[PDB]
A paper describes a structure:
H2 oxidation (or ‘uptake’) is catalysed in S. enterica by three [NiFe]-hydrogenases encoded by the hyaABCDEF (STM1786–STM1791), hybOABCEDFG (STM3150–STM3143), and hydABCDEFGHI (STM1539–STM1531) operons. All three S. enterica H2-uptake enzymes comprise similar ‘core’ structures with a large subunit (or α-subunit) containing the [Ni–Fe–CO–2CN−] catalytic centre, and a small subunit (or β-subunit) containing three Fe–S clusters. Whereas the hya and hyb operons are up-regulated during fermentation and anaerobic respiration respectively, the hyd operon is optimally expressed under aerobic conditions. This finding led to an initial biochemical study of Hyd-5 that revealed that Hyd-5 belongs to a class of aerobically expressed ‘O2-tolerant’ hydrogenases, i.e. [NiFe]-hydrogenases, that can sustain H2 oxidation in the presence of O2. A key feature of the O2-tolerant enzymes is the special Fe–S cluster located proximal to the [NiFe] active site.
A strong promoter was placed upstream of the native hydABCDEFGHI operon on the S. enterica chromosome, and a stretch of sequence encoding the small subunit TM domain was replaced with DNA encoding an affinity tag. This allowed isolation and characterization of a water-soluble active variant of Hyd-5. The isolated Hyd-5 enzyme was subjected to size-exclusion chromatography before being concentrated and entered into crystallization experiments under standard aerobic conditions. Hyd-5 crystallized with three core hydrogenase αβ heterodimers in the asymmetric unit, and two of the three hydrogenase dimers associated with each other as an α2β2 heterotetramer. The third heterodimer in the asymmetric unit self-associates about a crystallographic 2-fold axis to produce the same α2β2 arrangement. The Hyd-5 structure also has strong feature in the electron density that would correspond to a hydrated Mg2+ ion. The Fe–S clusters are typical of an O2-tolerant hydrogenase, with a medial [3Fe–4S] cluster co-ordinated by three cysteine residues, and a distal cubane [4Fe–4S] cluster co-ordinated by three cysteines and one histidine. The special proximal [4Fe–3S] cluster of the small subunit is co-ordinated by six cysteine residues. Strikingly, however, a conserved histidine residue (His229) of the large subunit comes close to, and points directly at, the proximal [4Fe–3S] cluster. The distance between the large subunit His229 NE2 and Fe of the cluster is 3.3–3.5 Å, which is not a direct co-ordination of the metal, but certainly close enough to potentially have an effect on the properties of the cofactor. In the Hyd-5 structure, the Glu73 side chain appears to donate a hydrogen bond to the carbonyl of Pro230 in the large subunit, and this indicates that it is protonated.
Author numbering:
A (entry chain E): 3 to 585
B (entry chain F): 5 to 267
Amino acid sequence: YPYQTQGFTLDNSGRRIVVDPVTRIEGHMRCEVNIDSNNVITNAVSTGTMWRGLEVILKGRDPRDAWAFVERICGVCTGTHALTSIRAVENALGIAIPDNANCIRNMMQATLHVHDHLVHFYHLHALDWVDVVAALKADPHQTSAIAQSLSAWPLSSPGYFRDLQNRLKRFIESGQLGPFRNGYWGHPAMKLPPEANLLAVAHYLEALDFQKEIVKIHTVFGGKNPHPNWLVGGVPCAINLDETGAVGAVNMERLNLVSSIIQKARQFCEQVYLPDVLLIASYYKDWAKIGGGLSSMNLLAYGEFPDNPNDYSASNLLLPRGAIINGRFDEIHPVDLTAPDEIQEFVTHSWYTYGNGNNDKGLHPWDGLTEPQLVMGEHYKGTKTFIEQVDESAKYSWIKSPRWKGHAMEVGPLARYLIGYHQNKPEFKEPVDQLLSVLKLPKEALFSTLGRTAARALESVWAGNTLQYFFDRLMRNLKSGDTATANVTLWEPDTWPTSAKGVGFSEAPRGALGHWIKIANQKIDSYQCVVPTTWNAGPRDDKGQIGAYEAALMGTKLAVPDQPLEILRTLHSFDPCLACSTH
Amino acid sequence: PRTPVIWLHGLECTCCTESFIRSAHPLAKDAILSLISLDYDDTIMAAAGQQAEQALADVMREYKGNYIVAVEGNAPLNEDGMFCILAGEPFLEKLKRVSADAKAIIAWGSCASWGCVQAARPNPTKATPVHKLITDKPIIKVPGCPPIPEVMSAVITYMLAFDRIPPLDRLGRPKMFYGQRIHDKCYRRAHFDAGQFVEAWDDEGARKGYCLYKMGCKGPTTYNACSTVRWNDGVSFPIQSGHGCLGCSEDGFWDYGSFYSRA
Ligand code: NFU
Ligand code: SF4
Ligand code: F3S
Ligand SMILES: [Cl-]
Ligand SMILES: [Cl-]
Ligand SMILES: [Mg+2]
């Protein structure tokens, strides 16, 4: 059925390219696309290739333990799941956490945002835009000069570049490229000179060394990264600055370390990451017109970083909350997770069931159901052990299809950054505006793979500042004699309602995350997760309506079809995490 | 020449790969460029799709019988292995094919070693660890969710330097790091021994560094180096930062009862 849904028009004839495994993402995806005779994508298909089933594993466990299980949904997006879980439980039981706990949590979430975004740009996304071998051609003296006219970052000596270049050369000439093996070097879509190439590669390596630090903030408060620890009722990292056993607690020496790290992280995002995006952007300026997909039309975010504790009102969430529809940015609709007709996920084109004939019907997560049913349809190609080609007319992903009042949405940095922009908050508007001015592009350039990538960088700096801000607030708490870290009044389960519903939410690095728990007889009854990459990588629905990922591949021209570098760019710009998507 | 290492991802949350890069001495940069050849790795490798599979075939064919397979994640058995699908094929085949020609196998993390969270009751995906599937090759289990960054790196640098499999225990864990209980080298132990406990969060005990045993710490049943090597450049470890050991390096810790119970 050559049919048309949302601006785009979909054709299932023409050549069919396959990308499996999709690398430089978390976990397992499979993309399939169709091209026309002219090498333009007439169809795009997003298949999640894994599942583990926490939604099921949590039945009948202690709601206090929940965060530790759901934490292990994902080690890249680390802690955003735990944080949501505790919020959800706390929400249900009515627990109020103290100010210092709300501070520390927000610091740890901000630390994630910074760290994740940085590791993602360099170590997942960059090699779509950076020719590593090309870098061997470069002149160190210019490379330095470029990197120095780009920023005040001190690691720029020509000697440092020569030496790294010679190291890189020996690596490549060794004939053991490791991660660079059979990479897309020389591709015609690679578009930056050897100087900007060597530069990026150096920063790639510097980032790989430095990222390891940023996460020590998690280490101090959470105990370890990845997979730090959290607590229903507050935080475990109890504070004791000045009295006798302070060595067994968060004290002045720990807080000093944390302070010290924050400053380094913001410095790295401010002087290294964001600039290199502006340099790299400038060469790929036409990628401002590729990969909008849903971004120009439909956006969603739940907000994040409550300033005052226990107020999850939009009024108090530093990161924007809201919902856009059909390019109506004048009308930024507010978001309600209790509402049952509001926030839903269909399985119509996904390998789960909802019972017979209710396959077309969509479910709010308090009623949601994760029961798997693997079955391929009529136009399927392969066996039970093999997949030559997926049948998208039927069920085709391990990812559920989430919708907001029946509209397919795009979530993530760009989404918040757009909502906050039209909410007219200058903490987002101005830095977005100044980015456009330097690249000499208009508002609409944001609606693209390039804009989506810019949005992420802008946030790492913002998130850095927020991190400092919540450290600054923790400190004014302690100066004023508030050192409390945990409410323990409902820590005992015999103190709980006999049954209770709850919603936990967060704005994770990749987008809008929610957990819809039900407690009953001191045990978990429901537990349902709708995670950001679920929204984005989600298959189609009852309506036949496509998701953010598929939509964004749609206009794309494949310079070389055998080597789909172009598809990877767009897909990587959404920061895919499929563990995260499927749970 | 550098020892080639093929790093596979099965069912997993990618967390031991994230842990590995947190290594400080040696830097994961310095491992990648100078100690090993990280020849296939879903998470960071430039190549995708056919180009990615080709690159693997290249290194197996070429470095056959001499390469090390690192496995993070485990393999689901139910629905004929299609709860985890790499290049149109269940992960289980890909594992068997790659490890048949390998010199030795490192099982990173609790997923590959035991099952971890996907394998917690009622384990719908029938998630099954490496050593229950590959049984004709030597397996080093380096467990924990995740392992300690500098443990992972020290295991590799040891094997390269001494050209040996390190001494394993009954479970296949390098004794060097998994030989002693967290609790038998814990700093808060003095307090345990003198009955000084955190009884509830943020009590005088907690703020004084008291033993977390009553708050459900599983350090006394749990082998890892967390109390000694510690996490992230030895900055801290779960207990030091106020929370009891989860027992995350041991088999079945998810179904060992609650995390906040004494067991
Ligand atoms: N950000 C982020 Fe994660 Ni691997 C996703 N999707 C989160 O929940
Ligand atoms: S905190 Fe845990 S490992 Fe440390 S002394 Fe107490 S019970 Fe033992
Ligand atoms: S959770 Fe893991 S890191 Fe150590 S203290 Fe317990 S074994
Ligand atoms: Cl260093
Ligand atoms: Cl070298
Ligand atoms: Mg779900």
